[PDB]
């Protein structure tokens, strides 16, 4: 399974959501592809009209990538709904299966089957699907991070991401679960919270990962 | 068309008497002739076929297995587009033909669960195990067979062309056929349908298969 250039612009989609900036070989490494891998794909995306570089920003998306970028999103979604509640994947099996089939199923067959699926609004991670050429507009958008006041929160989104998915596992995390908000170790550099009566600390990074709403 | 498809059209060739040629290759699938001679090389090179010169290219077990595999794909990804996402027959084939190549087999184990285990497809094709060699519960073609009667029509090729010829005709898969006359010289058959006649050459009658 070899992630094409396309996923470039889903990984830049959400950076653009998020306001931050990193580098494209941060970009490559959580792509699980070589530097000079991306180096070419982003090549060929600037060739393609897909993204430009911007003098200060970075690599932003044309209009053209965002169409692109909530397309995939889409169907990256749809598809992993109907593996997950049809065909019985696991959260550590859906990503592969569902990145091939995003790139080789026709429009046809995505509109039907989100028909199928009765038009599931939200995928495993708990990311917004958008209708047919709609732009991505995430239902849940607030970070753990950055997070001011304390009490309790439900956990309604989290990132399609492997070691993400392995955090949640050894520490008994799942979507829609009420984790309370202690206090931000300042620190630690972590933020405190409760969950069934038990103490766990998030630290910042994986706090970025995670996105929650209060009660 | 990758070489993999190739496999297929050599294989659903050697079901016909006829010997097979480069150049009625390229017809079946409609490709460039030396193209043909480009893929079929490469096929010859991994030995998934070989030259006879009584039969022109034959399947061998890699071959055999391989297109079966190929076949279970297929089939599996019809019974689900037609049953489940409500695909009518002239739209199965491209989905099903891009799927077959992109599709884990834990995909198509799961979905051959998930379906119930079908054990044929729309086209009344038999759909074998994992790893298990393809073997065609309904194997008797109209072409070939002498026995005045009834029979009925179980199973059909995989053919845009089939599909066309059997709606304007308004045959489908489970209609009883009486066999009325065979010309040996032209290579036609006659058969009756519900007190309707019809005249099929013996080409077309080699792309269906029926019982008693
Ligand atoms: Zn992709
Ligand atoms: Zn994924
Ligand atoms: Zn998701
Ligand atoms: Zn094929
Ligand atoms: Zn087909
Ligand atoms: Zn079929
Ligand atoms: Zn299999
Ligand atoms: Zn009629």
């Not at 089957?113 to 047919?132: A, E, R, S």
């Amino acid at each position: 399974m070899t992630p094409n250039k396309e996923d470039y612009l889903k990984i830049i989609y959400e950076l653009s959501e998020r306001d931050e900036k990193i580098s494209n070989k941060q970009i490559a490494e959580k792509m699980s592809v070589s530097a000079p891998a991306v180096s070419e794909m982003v090549k060929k995306l600037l060739l393609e009209d897909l993204v430009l570089k911007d003098k200060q920003a970075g690599y932003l998306l044309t209009k053209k990538g965002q169409i692109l970028a909530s397309s995939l999103y889409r169907k990256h979604r749809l598809i992993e709904v109907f593996l997950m509640n049809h065909l019985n994947y696991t959260a550590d099996e859906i990503h592969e299966e569902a990145e091939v089939l995003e790139h080789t199923v026709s429009d046809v067959f995505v509109e039907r089957l989100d028909k199928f699926l009765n038009y599931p609004k939200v995928c495993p991670h708990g990311g917004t699907i958008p209708q047919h050429g709609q732009p991505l507009v995430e239902r849940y958008r607030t970070t753990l991070k950055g997070v001011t006041e304390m009490g309790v929160y439900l956990l309604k989104r989290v990132q399609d991401n492997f070691q993400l998915l392995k955090y949640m596992e050894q520490h008994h995390l799942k979507i829609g679960d009420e984790l309370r908000l202690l206090e931000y170790d300042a620190f630690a550099g972590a933020y405190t919270i409760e969950k069934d009566g038990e103490q766990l600390q998030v630290t910042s990074a994986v706090a970025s990962q995670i996105y929650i709403e209060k009660k």
